[PDB]
């Protein structure tokens, strides 16, 4: 009851859940010690946090922070430190423990000594393109973020199919404007315009035959996150697989 602490956990896409703990001197404790300190004419407190650490599991391992941290001391403040946990594909929820050491130094070198230790579970409170029909999956083997200029470049698809008939699909980019509140109308027009002529495929209408190298050239500068022009058509039972993957900046 001197510094209220909370922990926030987020799930990054790079298979590393990041959990950040936040500490803040609570206002009720602030006024509680503040009137008794201002009786002796003190305006700013001094809670010296000298040893803050987090532990892992039933065997105690000290996972470090993401940056440096000295031994600080301040009043009426808040500070947050972020550790990087490991992403779990199973349903084993990791339970961690944190500990601090607040030295509540009253003045003229007459200090008290306080320590605290919480322990809880680091929950989070709740791409590979796959089709809807068959076993056919898509994933770009080369890193989906890429930094290019407006020059010629290459990109690499990959197909994991049912081995019964691996062939009979075609790719094409469809360089035409999709046929569409004037402000939202023109915003959707600018999205559909820079999609339809931003990059151009240097081999479209292209029969596939488990790799498939397909080659572009990029014209217009900008970050094309989930570049969604190119559209792999499946010949038999005529449907379309969108490929919402890959993101190329062109600067």
């Amino acid at each position: 009851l001197l510094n209220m602490r909370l922990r926030n956990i987020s799930l990054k896409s790079e298979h590393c859940i990041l959990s950040s703990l936040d500490f803040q001197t609570s206002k009720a404790s602030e006024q509680l010690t503040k009137k008794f300190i201002y009786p002796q004419e003190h305006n700013s407190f001094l809670k010296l946090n000298f040893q803050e650490i987090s532990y892992k599991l039933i065997d105690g391992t000290s996972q470090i922070e993401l940056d440096p941290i000295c031994p600080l001391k301040v009043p009426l403040t808040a500070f947050s430190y972020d550790s990087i946990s490991a992403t779990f594909k199973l349903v084993l929820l990791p339970k961690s423990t944190q500990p601090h050491r607040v030295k509540i130094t009253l003045a003229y070198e007459l200090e008290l000594h306080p320590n605290l230790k919480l322990p809880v579970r680091t929950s989070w409170e709740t791409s590979l393109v796959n089709s809807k029909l068959s076993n056919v999956k898509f994933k770009f083997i080369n890193s989906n973020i890429k930094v290019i200029k407006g020059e010629k470049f290459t990109m690499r698809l990959q197909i994991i199919n049912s081995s019964s008939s691996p062939l009979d699909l075609v790719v094409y980019y469809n360089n035409t404007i999709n046929p569409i509140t004037l402000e939202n109308q023109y915003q959707l027009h600018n999205k559909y315009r820079k999609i339809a002529e931003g990059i151009i495929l240097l081999s479209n209408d292209y029969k596939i035959p488990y790799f498939a190298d397909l080659r572009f050239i990029g014209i217009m500068s900008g970050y094309y996150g989930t570049l969604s022009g190119l559209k792999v058509l499946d010949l038999n039972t005529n449907e379309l697989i969108e490929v919402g993957n890959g993101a190329s900046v062109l600067i």
């Binding site: 987020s10 950040s20 301040v74 009426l76 403040t77 808040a78 947050s80 430190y81 972020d82």
Partner: peptide, 11 residues
């Protein structure tokens, strides 16, 4: 003044 943040996250 009084500060109330340290090493935040831009999300």
């Amino acid at each position: 003044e009084w500060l109330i943040h340290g090493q935040k996250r831009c999300a």
